């Protein structure tokens, strides 16, 4: 996260760290959506152009964390993956269309002050909040600058950007399964996701019921915090019927 | 069915459940109030 700040303790209790077993390295962010289900970006698990192609046993997840590196005694919990589900129409060859994946934990994780699931948006929540200029919040342990790793989880608040401005900012084909967020050059403020933040959540707090909702997944960007560029995010609501199909068919 | 998800989702133990605000959530709320 570029131009953010340290998260507060307990600020993002749905935050999940995706950790590669061998060689050991932080792969991506992710989010907890129930005691058994973790949501991430498909490209964190499958992206052949960068030689990424992970199965359930290649990875583990760490939940409840704040420090990037320190073992957090009686706070963090490690979990194994029983199954990975990548969107069957995820477009890794081109533009990361449908950049979404679910991971089923082998054992349910116990909730705590530091571990708690985020909500997925209903239709009214999505309509009321997915508006240009409305701010969401991005969290992760990714790089602090484009060219530099944080000691603790970082947080930044960023406004959703009008779709034509998103499209003008990039040579990539932007689909209805993506939105972009970030400050414009004239706005002064800065901030972006960066390498290592992929797969983490873009969340918004409903002023109607006080709950945090996951509206986006950190998907891709051209650099980090560049003037005239914006971070792109998976449009979670638009893919929610797939999420619910996976949980209806394979959840318990 | 998963449906709405956890009945308790999105309410943080150390914030909403204690009636405590985090350091920047006000910035989000203010951005959800429209102009004229």
């Amino acid at each position: 996260i570029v131009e953010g700040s340290d998260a507060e303790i307990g600020m993002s209790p749905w935050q999940v760290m995706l950790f590669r077993k061998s060689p050991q390295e932080l792969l991506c962010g992710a989010s907890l959506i129930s005691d058994r289900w973790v949501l991430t970006a498909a490209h964190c698990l499958l992206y052949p152009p960068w030689d990424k192609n992970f199965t359930e046993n290649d990875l583990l997840v760490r939940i409840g964390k704040h420090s990037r590196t320190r073992y957090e005694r009686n706070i963090e919990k490690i979990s194994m993956l029983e199954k990975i589900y990548i969107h069957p129409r995820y477009n890794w060859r081109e533009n990361l269309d449908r950049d979404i994946a679910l991971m089923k934990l082998k054992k349910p994780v116990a909730f705590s002050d530091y571990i708690h699931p985020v909500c997925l948006p209903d239709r009214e929540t999505a309509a009321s909040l997915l508006q240009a200029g409305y701010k969401g919040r991005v969290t992760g342990w990714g790089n602090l600058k484009e060219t530099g790793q944080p000691s603790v989880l970082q947080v930044v608040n960023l406004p959703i950007v009008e779709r034509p401005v998103c499209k003008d900012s990039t040579r990539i084909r932007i689909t209805d399964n993506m939105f972009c967020a970030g400050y414009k050059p004239d706005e002064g403020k800065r901030g972006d996701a960066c390498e290592g933040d992929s797969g983490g959540p873009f969340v918004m707090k409903s002023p109607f019921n006080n709950r945090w909702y996951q509206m986006g997944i950190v998907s891709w960007g051209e650099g980090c915090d560049r003037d005239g560029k914006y971070g792109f995010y998976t449009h979670v609501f638009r893919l929610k019927k797939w999420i619910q199909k996976v949980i209806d068919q394979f959840g318990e | 069915t998963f449906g709405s998800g956890e009945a308790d989702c999105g309410l943080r133990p150390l914030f909403e459940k204690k009636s405590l605000e985090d350091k920047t959530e006000r910035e989000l709320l203010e951005s959800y109030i429209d102009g004229r």
């Binding site: 533009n95 508006q131 484009e146 950007v161 990539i172 993506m178 939105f179 609501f237 | -």
Partner: peptide, 25 residues
Amino acid sequence: GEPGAPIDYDEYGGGTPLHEIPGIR
């Protein structure tokens, strides 16, 4: 106040690859 993303659902029924863009992440 303008929609940032459409309120509908992805259903069944091409350009530059992301990896070709300098600085892509």
